Amino acid sequence: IVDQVITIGKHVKGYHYIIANLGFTDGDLLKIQFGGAEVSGFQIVDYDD
Amino acid sequence: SIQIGGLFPRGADQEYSAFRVGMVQFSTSEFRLTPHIDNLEVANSFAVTNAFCSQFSRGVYAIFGFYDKKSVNTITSFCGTLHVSFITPSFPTDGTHPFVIQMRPDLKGALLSLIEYYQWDKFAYLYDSDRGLSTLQAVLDSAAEKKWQVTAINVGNINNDKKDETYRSLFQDLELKKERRVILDCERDKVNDIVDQVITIGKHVKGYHYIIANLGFTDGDLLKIQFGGAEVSGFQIVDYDDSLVSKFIERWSTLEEKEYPGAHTATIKYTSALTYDAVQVMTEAFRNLRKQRIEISRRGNAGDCLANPAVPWGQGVEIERALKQVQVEGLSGNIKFDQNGKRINYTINIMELKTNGPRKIGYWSEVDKMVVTLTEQKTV
Amino acid sequence: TNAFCSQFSRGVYAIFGFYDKKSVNTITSFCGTLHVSFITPSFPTDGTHPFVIQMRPDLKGALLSLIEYYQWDKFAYLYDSDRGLSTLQAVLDSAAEKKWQVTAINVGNKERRVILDCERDKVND
Amino acid sequence: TPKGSSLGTPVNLAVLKLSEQGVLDKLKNKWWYDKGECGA
Numbered sequence: 001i002v003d004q005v006i007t008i009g010k011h012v013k014g015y016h017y018i019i020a021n022l023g024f025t026d027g028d029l030l031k032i033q034f035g036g037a038e039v040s041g042f043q044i045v046d047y048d049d
Numbered sequence: 050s051i052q053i054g055g056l057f058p059r060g061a062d063q064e065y066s067a068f069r070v071g072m073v074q075f076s077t078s079e080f081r082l083t084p085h086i087d088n089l090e091v092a093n094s095f096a097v098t099n100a101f102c103s104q105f106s107r108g109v110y111a112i113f114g115f116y117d118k119k120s121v122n123t124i125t126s127f128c129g130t131l132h133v134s135f136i137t138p139s140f141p142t143d144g145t146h147p148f149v150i151q152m153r154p155d156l157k158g159a160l161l162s163l164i165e166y167y168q169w170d171k172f173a174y175l176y177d178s179d180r181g182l183s184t185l186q187a188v189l190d191s192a193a194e195k196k197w198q199v200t201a202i203n204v205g206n207i208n209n210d211k212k213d214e215t216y217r218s219l220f221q222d223l224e225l226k227k228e229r230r231v232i233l234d235c236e237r238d239k240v241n242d243i244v245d246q247v248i249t250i251g252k253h254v255k256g257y258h259y260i261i262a263n264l265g266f267t268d269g270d271l272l273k274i275q276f277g278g279a280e281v282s283g284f285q286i287v288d289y290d291d292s293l294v295s296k297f298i299e300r301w302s303t304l305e306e307k308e309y310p311g312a313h314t315a316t317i318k319y320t321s322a323l324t325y326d327a328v329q330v331m332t333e334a335f336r337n338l339r340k341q342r343i344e345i346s347r348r349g350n351a352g353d354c355l356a357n358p359a360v361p362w363g364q365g366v367e368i369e370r371a372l373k374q375v376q377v378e379g380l381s382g383n384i385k386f387d388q389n390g391k392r393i394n395y396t397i398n399i400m401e402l403k404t405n406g407p408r409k410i411g412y413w414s415e416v417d418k419m420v421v422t423l424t425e426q427k428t429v
Numbered sequence: 430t431n432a433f434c435s436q437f438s439r440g441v442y443a444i445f446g447f448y449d450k451k452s453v454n455t456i457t458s459f460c461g462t463l464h465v466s467f468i469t470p471s472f473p474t475d476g477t478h479p480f481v482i483q484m485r486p487d488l489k490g491a492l493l494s495l496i497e498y499y500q501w502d503k504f505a506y507l508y509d510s511d512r513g514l515s516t517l518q519a520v521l522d523s524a525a526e527k528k529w530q531v532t533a534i535n536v537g538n539k540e541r542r543v544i545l546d547c548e549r550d551k552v553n554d
Numbered sequence: 555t556p557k558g559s560s561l562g563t564p565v566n567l568a569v570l571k572l573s574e575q576g577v578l579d580k581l582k583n584k585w586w587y588d589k590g591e592c593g594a
């Protein structure tokens with residue numbers, strides 16, 4: 001679905017996406033990173049520990 | 050039983066597969082071309098020199114190869130001096146260069162004519178240093194006469210380490226200038242990389258226009274930029290509607306992927322197509338020499354290529370004339386050559402990217418310029 | 430190739446010569462492979478090529494500083510296609526950066542301010 | 555504008571256009587008399 005989002009160019013500024021999953025960094029944040037849109041999600045596994 | 054030499058880049062496989070397919074297809078009862086293939090890094094002048102010398106010591110009658118902007122002058126000078134015919138898919142040299150048969154049609158005219166067709170005033174031009182700067186000179190020279198404001202940016206200096214950063218910086222700078230029209234003269238890999246970066250920066254949205262200038266319009270992936278909405282135009286050398294092309298498509302798609310690398314595809318890269326058609330042209334050239342009852346044999350070995358004073362071999366002239374007089378039908382359409390080794394009478398499909406898929410909006414001929422072929426909400 | 434290999438057969442420790450846009454890659458590649466040093470008055474290479482010592486300094490930065498110095502906004506640029514496109518690529522990229530309007534003409538086949546990048550012979554013509 | 559800068563001439567022409575098409579005058583009337591505290 002995110003792939004589709006990037007295809008339709010809805011990742012431009014003024015857009016906000018929230019991924020609800022236990023994973024966040026699990027999926028790819030990189031392709032949608034430079035998009036300009038703001039994305040927020042939550043990760044259960046903290047790599048800091 | 051004709052000895053021919055060949056030079057291939059270590060990185061491009063499909064061209065070799067298409068070459069082998071050309072060998073099988075165009076082989077005949079009377080004679081069969083015998084290739085001697087050398088895989089090597091193309092941009093290296095030393096490598097090219099040694100390859101050509103090894104092929105010449107075996108006394109091959111003609112050489113099919115690829116060259117790069119760094120390797121080109123070694124080739125033109127060697128073939129010109131030692132009278133050996135060179136047949137290539139590579140970008141045509143601008144000039145008088147002898148003993149070189151360039152399989153690729155000239156892209157400048159179609160590009161400029163297309164720029165005029167969209168009535169573009171100000172546009173951006175991204176040029177790759179390695180493919181040659183000829184077309185840059187073209188669009189600038191024409192921009193001088195046409196009042197065009199042109200921003201020309203060299204994209205070819207990028208490191209393996211830093212890729213996305215340079216393109217993001219560049220398109221950020223072009224976002225600051227807010228320029229909506231981009232022209233890409235680049236190799237297909239760089240075309241796709243830059244495309245991916247554009248998609249990431251989200252500049253494929255409506256209001257933008259892209260022109261991919263190469264004959265590889267369907268080689269590169271248009272699918273990810275298809276639903277985007279920004280109009281993309283390109284140049285297609287191979288028309289898939291034509292029967293010869295379709296037959297080649299069935300044969301190509303039939304092949305086991307393992308035996309011929311990357312052959313299973315329903316679409317073929319244009320360089321490989323030119324390779325195949327080059328095999329055809331060589332075959333027909335030697336058949337032509339056979340029907341003139343000219344002896345194709347060399348009474349002795351050509352010897353060292355560096356021997357001084359240089360010894361040109363005689364028959365090579367006749368070979369060159371033969372290759373240049375060849376007129377054939379092939380994947381690229383009508384195939385004909387002038388004296389310089391350039392293609393003539395050629396035709397290029399002008400294609401626009403549409404929601405359903407790639408379509409043919411028009412066609413271009415050197416004599417005919419740009420030619421258009423003609424192709425809901427209620428109202429109260 | 431002939432002359433250089435001739436010098437290599439004679440076992441020279443280093444070579445002093447000239448090159449042109451056509452022959453430069455031959456010298457760079459061969460010096461690079463054979464590890465023999467080349468010393469030249471000619472134009473600097475576009476790259477990091479080894480075993481090449483350029484007696485000539487690169488002119489690009491100086492030129493840009495000069496164009497920036499006269500505060501040129503829009504100007505005209507005449508490049509000799511025979512010598513090289515290096516400085517042209519430079520002034521165009523830096524034009525895209527600096528908001529310059531540049532008219533680039535290939536003389537190798539309107540503004541009052543003209544930059545001539547050419548051999549001294551062409552300038553007179 | 556700073557002397558010899560790139561912005562000077564185009565902002566100059568911009569000012570020309572704005573004077574000609576009545577933007578400057580309208581703006582003037584907006585900030586002086588129209589936002590005025592007393593009468594006319």
Ligand SMILES: *[C@@H]1O[C@H](CO)[C@@H](O)[C@H](O)[C@H]1NC(C)=O
Nearest residue numbers: 376383384385386393394395
């Ligand atoms: C020009 O192309 C046409 C096909 O469009 C062909 O019939 C003709 O022979 C060509 N002329 C040549 C090869 O001189």
